[PDB]
Design a protein around this ligand. Structure first.
Ligand code: ATP
Ligand code: ADP
Ligand code: MG
Ligand code: MG
Lengths: 48, 489, 463, 463, 129, 129
């Protein structure tokens, strides 16, 4: 009965690291998307 | 009126002139108040020029005049020990400079046949850089990392370590507050490194044109010694601020951008500058100086600095610059905050010149250390989900830990060739296998101190020549054993 | 030698002058018959200038006559501005009479040169025990304030103003960039409730103002602080001045809004091309010279909880220290609520502060971190597993946590406690003695709400 | 007659002629009193053409005079170009006098038709384990190397040249497009040290040159290779040709740098609207016809480590064998860092290489894919809960990726170890033995940086 | 007391009008003064002092204080609390009340998400009980 | 039975032609009428009745029907089927056959993914057995 809790605490730490990395990737993608949309809008505006 | 005109439009540091018919590309133009500009667009009926200074004193209807000369800055040995701005005007208050020459700011690097391979080492004083990422005369090496990781400290230590080798140094500051520049100048002056160093400053309050033009002026100043058979070394601080300023200028010129709103030719801006650092051959030197100097080769080493966001080395500009230089040193925040300083990432950092830019003893002793460190890092990362460990894995892990702890240094504390050689020999032959992990630094310091105390002639001989022999290796092994037997740490 | 309006589009107005009377950049113009000031932004040719209107533009029309002042926006400066409230143009809005002084100073000026920099990096003493030991300040630096409402920010502002006026005989300037009117009124009456109003000047910029006003309101406070710093008493000592900026993020937002209004191509994540240059030109006039020194404290808000965003990164390019307030500390009643483990300063370095100061700070941080680690085991597996040095660390960490609170000078009217201004030399002695274990028998409650170590001794001998 | 310059913007210049002497689309012009050559790009009407300079435009002014040549850019060809170094215009830059031929060929020409196409029907060995096993080459085909910055494109190219071109019986052409000058000097001196300088020709335009030189530098080497391909001897057959191109991506980058100044509208992520057409125009010329064959190797740069970027994605469809390098493998100390789950070849079918080779490759790829699948559950959870077959798969896959490393001959400077060459029979033997399960007791450290399986056995025994 | 049905539709109409009037677009084609559009509307909800009322009415009303309260409403899509107009609005108000679809679909009638809903004014706007 | 090997390259060529003629671009710089371009081509494949054949041939052909089947090909970027061009073709056509890289590398050949592959005609186009 004394090893299950070790297993769960290790799993929780790994999940925290995972969500940290995923948040970094998400922020990068969000900035890229905003930049692309703004560039597309400006390009469409200039062509008229 | 062929060399006269009038200002028509003024906005955001860019002016429009109408009348300069006999104007060249890149020619210098002087205004009514004593200011200077540079022509960029020779339109059908107008000229577009950026202002090299403060444009708030310019109004429509003033006068403009062509001078018939391209941008140029003073050069010579008189600039050593001074502090100047991007145009060479002094800002330290010590009086005017009396340089005897000028030199164009935009040039093209020497061709393929005029160069020579790099074979002369350059010492930065760091134990990890010297034995893992060697630097040679003529090489271009990149320092990259996040903010507050210890890049300027590495650059200043590299400048300081050239006290005896007799090579000249140049420091360029782009987009920095004045107080930091003053502190750096003070630290350089206290140690005496200011006796052979020049400083070019483009502060954060300066116009974007000067922050975009300063590194070219610094390189032009540093090329004086290369063309005459001597050696130099130039450091570019925050090369990304130059890209930011160029992006601002281009966007204010209404030009379509690419990735991260950067201009199309952002690669050419850096490739044109970083290609000027090289090593020329004796024939080029003789042709340049008309036989005044013969049998001598020149060189110019560069250490650009670039900062990343959250340790993302896969960004547009970091990768654009990595593909130009001959290697890179990567500094990571995870090791820095954990107490590993300098925080050199062994798996990412690499040098393209290789083992031909270091002395014989260091080249022979330090072979395959970086790849082994990367393999240990990967194995340690993987070996968290297992408990049954074989002998080879355990030995590899416990050797990697010792190797990692060995490469730890303090700033303002250079190392010699003999110290690195003896430490690397001690690590390579397994004399630190029975040493506890947390006493490695004390062991290294005590070994260096005792070896200097009791074996002065050997250390001196290794320092001057840096050669390897069987008797030298036997003496090193005997000294290490003698220290291990008697001395305590 | 007069111009007229030719075009009005929103808050952008074009004025045409005569070809030999065109004004210069950043000059201020006056519309004849109304009360509107136009600031020049750029020239276009043929005598046409594109400007920006300070205020609302309802009721204007083309053809109105305008005259030039041939100078930038000049605001009144001096000691008569202490305790008053003004707008971006330097006009009272608190209904207390006109400003008495006649001196004026332009709001646009070049930053001090490289030769005028100070020859050292001194420290700014605050009196707060937690700040002076773990995140020490520095003259001429910039400090960013984190944490939202509910933990105490305005109170810290009061205490800093009062202490800097008391110890170093300095003054203060407060500039509000895009402030709520309700919270601003509450803050003004909060200062008036105490006796701190007479030692600080206000310039207010609110959310419902045109974006031009929210952009040029920090320069007025900067000019006032510059005049306060430059003036000297006998022997020319100079003064130390504190500048308060309501939110630099709203300064950036106003900058990009004005850039978008002027019609410039955006860069990176929607921001204006001249972000870093603007923020540097704002922060390059805040420095420490030979005569005096201007120090600034600004509130920082991280958009989208992403530090990689361009504006927080450009902010962090200049900050020498960050102070973060946590709700967990305030939940335990320890005030001020400043987290010790997350506040950082670039001055905490053995070169700058010395050897013993740095070592004491590092040891305190290590003890606090180890206590935080042991909290989980204490809570989950029970108390019994923890004894000897674990409980030694627990007791020392609890004592350290209690010792970080102190009464304030501005709260003496409410609770009656006069408050204390602990000098820096006293804190180091107390913490070094605590770490060595000399006070291992004193109860925890003796470290509560006390100024210095002698007060702890007195409380322990009483309790 | 002659025209005059009316406008210059960067590298783009336009000239105005009379209505009866406008040059054709791809003509060459010379500026009087200067060494500057211009190439026409577009015809804009009213006797105005738009050109691109082949050099620096400093010191150029409006109103100069320009004379036409009524011909495209012509370069020398033949045996007189062997052992010499030339620039984009065909001028010698090796300080060894002029070129000793008279034949000239234009650099612009149409691609071969559909009827004059041949089929490659010959394998070609290299001595590299991973390439031989999983991406075989074909004599007369096209090969491309994909990778980011600092992953090993140049080293692999040099090793391929060392293994193939040295034992060749024919001619070779090397083209440098936007690379380092130090590498060119090193390669020239390496070839001159040996006695193979008489079989190669070199064209060099590097990253320090204006975009005009970098735009058209590949066409010169392509023209030389084309002339060498369609060359016959009286009673003598033709000769096989090897062609090496360095960073063909710089050609498209230089095309991008001048698109806006030519008056076009951008597409995708800031790219020119004619990317695919101008890539295909160049790519369709590098081919083998009925009369003569060409074997080519190209290096393709991947910007920002993004294989989805339009340039590599467009390039992918023009090659027969594709080798992809990954930074994740390189950062782990494994060289060459070739990704085995993204490298393909048209020769990998059982009718060409035999049954056994195909089965070995398929089994290896299947094992690697299964391990990559299991990685996540291995990471977040433990390893004990896995099935025994999964543990065997993990160990076998780790040993397999260890066994794909090999020490090169040209990498002796970096590591200090001598190079190794492995025939493919030993590779097949070792991989079949590994997949069978004969080496399940060998530690995975013995598979790192060795040659055949015999070296693995020796290194394991010595351990 | 005034209730604003949905300010997002107002923002959408403002964007359409601005685009039709060929003003330089910003993020998501919004003009440069959307924050100026919402903040200046929300700043007119206030409580004024008795002296202001006395001045306005020239002494007709002596000891009374006026007031005006607003209850704006903003809609989200799967909890996107980081878009442009919603963040602009959230920066201005003095509190927030969060309602999620996973609560109404589950069967919660109030469906108030108490986790991230706070009131800045607090206990001063309540009675003793 | 007709087969187009890449409609993406046709769309790219059309985009180049449209951009060179200075027409206003949209998402991913494609013109406004790419959907029209693909739809007015893919709508020409169908089955006709016997009366249509009789009328077209003026009685030469009496009792037979005609048909024309189409098999277009579309290539995605890293399995992103939410791009501008593939969505239009997916909406236009009846069924789709999805091929996956992970299945191909795992030995499943052909790499048909039965989870998201449909045929709207269904069993009406099959032999009895
Ligand atoms: N080897 C070292 N050991 C310990 N501390 C070090 C070492 N090298 C640098 N530091 C310290 O770490 C900090 C890094 O400052 P530094 O100016 O070198 O960083 P940076 O990367 O240039 O930062 P910035 O982004 O401000 O330019 C300084 O306080 C410096 O004293
Ligand atoms: N087989 C190898 N052994 C050791 N080091 C290698 C090997 N291949 C590449 N490297 C290292 O990778 C770096 C990149 O090599 P190179 O191909 O010249 O650059 P790029 O990949 O940018 O063209 C080199 O500096 C070299 O040290
Ligand atoms: Mg620095
Ligand atoms: Mg490369």
């Amino acid at each position: 009965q004394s090893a299950r809790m070790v297993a769960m605490k290790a799993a929780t730490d790994n999940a925290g690291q995972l969500i940290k990395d995923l948040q970094l990737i998400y922020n990068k993608l969000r900035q890229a998307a905003i930049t692309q949309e703004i560039s597309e809008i400006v390009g469409g505006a200039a062509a008229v | 009126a062929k060399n006269e005109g009038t200002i028509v439009m003024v906005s955001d540091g860019i002016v429009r002139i109408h009348g300069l018919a006999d104007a060249m590309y890149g020619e210098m133009i002087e205004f009514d108040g004593g200011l200077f500009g540079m022509a960029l667009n020779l339109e059908q009926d107008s000229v577009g020029a950026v202002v090299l200074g403060n444009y708030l004193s310019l109004q429509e209807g003033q006068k403009a005049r062509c001078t018939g000369r391209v941008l140029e800055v003073p050069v010579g040995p008189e600039l050593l020990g001074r502090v100047v701005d991007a145009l060479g005007n002094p800002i330290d208050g010590k009086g005017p400079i009396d340089a005897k020459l000028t030199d164009a700011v935009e040039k093209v690097a020497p061709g393929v046949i005029w160069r020579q391979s790099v074979d002369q080492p350059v010492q930065t004083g760091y134990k990890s850089v010297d034995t893992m990422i060697p630097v040679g005369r003529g090489q271009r090496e990149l320092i990259i990392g996040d903010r507050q990781t210890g890049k300027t400290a590495m650059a200043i230590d590299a400048i300081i370590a050239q006290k005896n080798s007799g090579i000249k140094c140049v420091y360029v500051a782009i987009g920095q507050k004045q107080s930091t520049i003053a502190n750096v100048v003070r630290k350089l002056e206290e140690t005496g490194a200011m006796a052979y160093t020049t400083v070019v400053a483009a502060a954060a309050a300066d116009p974007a044109a000067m922050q975009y033009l300063a590194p070219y002026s610094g390189c032009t100043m540093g090329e004086y010694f290369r063309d005459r058979g001597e050696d130099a070394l130039i450091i570019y601080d925050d090369l990304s601020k130059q890209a930011v300023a160029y992006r601002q200028i281009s966007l204010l010129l209404r030009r379509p951008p690419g990735r991260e709103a950067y201009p199309g030719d952002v690669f050419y801006l850096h490739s044109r500058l970083l290609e000027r650092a090289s090593r020329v051959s004796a024939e080029y030197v003789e042709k340049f100086t008309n036989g005044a100097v013969t049998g001598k080769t020149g060189s110019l080493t560069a250490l650009p600095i670039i900062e990343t966001q959250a340790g993302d080395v896969s960004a547009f500009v970091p990768t654009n610059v990595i593909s130009i230089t001959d290697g890179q040193i990567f500094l990571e925040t995870s090791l820095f905050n954990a107490g590993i300083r300098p925080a050199v990432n062994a798996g990412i950092s690499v040098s393209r010149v290789g083992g031909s830019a270091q002395t014989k003893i260091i080249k022979k002793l330090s072979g395959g250390i970086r790849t082994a460190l990367a393999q240990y890092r990967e194995l340690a990362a993987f070996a968290q989900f297992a408990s049954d460990l074989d002998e080879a894995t355990r030995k590899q892990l416990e050797h990697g830990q010792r190797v990692t702890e060995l490469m730890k240094q303090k700033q303002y504390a250079p190392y010699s060739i003999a110290d690195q050689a003896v430490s690397v020999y001690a690590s390579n032959e397994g004399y630190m296998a029975d040493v506890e992990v947390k006493k490695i630094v004390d062991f290294d310091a005590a070994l260096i101190a005792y070896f200097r105390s009791e074996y002065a002639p050997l250390m001196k001989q290794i320092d001057e020549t840096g050669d390897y022999n069987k008797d030298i290796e036997a003496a090193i092994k005997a000294g290490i054993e003698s220290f291990k037997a008697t001395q305590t740490y | 030698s007069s111009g007229r309006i030719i075009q009005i589009i929103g808050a952008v107005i074009d004025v045409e002058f005569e070809r030999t009377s065109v004004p210069k950049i950043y000059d201020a113009l006056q519309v004849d018959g109304t009360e509107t000031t136009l600031e020049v932004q750029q020239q276009l040719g043929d005598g046409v200038v594109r400007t920006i209107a300070m205020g609302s533009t309802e009721g204007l029309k083309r053809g109105l006559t305008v005259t030039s002042t041939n100078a930038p926006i000049s605001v009144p400066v001096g000691t008569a501005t202490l305790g008053r409230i003004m707008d971006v143009l330097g006009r009272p809005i608190d209904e207390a009479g006109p400003v008495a002084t006649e001196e004026r100073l332009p709001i646009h000026r070049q930053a001090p040169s490289y030769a005028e920099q100070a020859a050292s990096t001194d420290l700014l003493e605050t009196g707060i025990k937690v700040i002076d030991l773990l995140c020490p300040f520095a003259k001429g630096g910039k400090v960013g304030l984190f944490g939202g409402a509910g933990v105490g920010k305005t109170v810290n502002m009061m205490e800093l103003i009062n202490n800097i006026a008391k110890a170093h005989s300095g003054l203060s300037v407060f500039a509000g960039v895009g402030e709520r009117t309700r919270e601003g009124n509450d803050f003004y009456h909060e200062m008036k409730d105490s006796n701190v109003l007479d030692k600080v000047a206000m310039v207010y910029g609110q959310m419902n103002e045109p974006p031009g006003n929210r952009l040029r309101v920090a320069l007025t406070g900067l000019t006032m602080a510059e005049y306060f710093r430059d003036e000297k008493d006998e022997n020319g000592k100079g003064r130390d001045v504190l500048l308060f900026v309501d939110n630099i993020y709203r300064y950036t937002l106003a900058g990009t809004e004005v850039s978008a209004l002027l019609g410039r191509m955006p860069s990176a994540v929607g921001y204006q091309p001249t972000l870093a240059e603007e923020m540097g030109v704002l922060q390059e006039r805040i420095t420490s010279t030979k005569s005096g020194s201007i120090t600034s404290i600004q509130a920082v808000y991280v958009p989208a909880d992403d530090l990689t965003d361009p504006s927080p990164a450009t902010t962090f390019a200049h900050l020498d220290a960050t102070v973060v307030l946590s709700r967990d500390i305030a939940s335990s009643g320890i005030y001020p609520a400043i987290d010790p483990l997350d506040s950082t300063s670039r001055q905490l370095d053995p070169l700058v502060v010395g050897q013993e100061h740095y070592e004491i700070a590092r040891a305190v941080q290590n003890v606090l971190q180890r206590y935080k680690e042991l909290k989980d085991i204490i809570a989950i597996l029970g108390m019994d597993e923890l004894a000897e040095e674990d409980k030694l660390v627990v007791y020392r960490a609890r004592k350290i946590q209690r010792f970080f609170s102190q009464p304030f000078h501005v709260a003496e009217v409410f609770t009656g406690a006069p408050g204390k201004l602990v000098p820096l030399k006293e804190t180091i002695r107390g913490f070094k003695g605590l770490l060595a274990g000399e006070y291992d028998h004193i109860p925890e409650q003796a470290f509560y709400m006390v100024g210095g170590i002698d007060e702890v001794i007195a409380k322990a001998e009483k309790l």
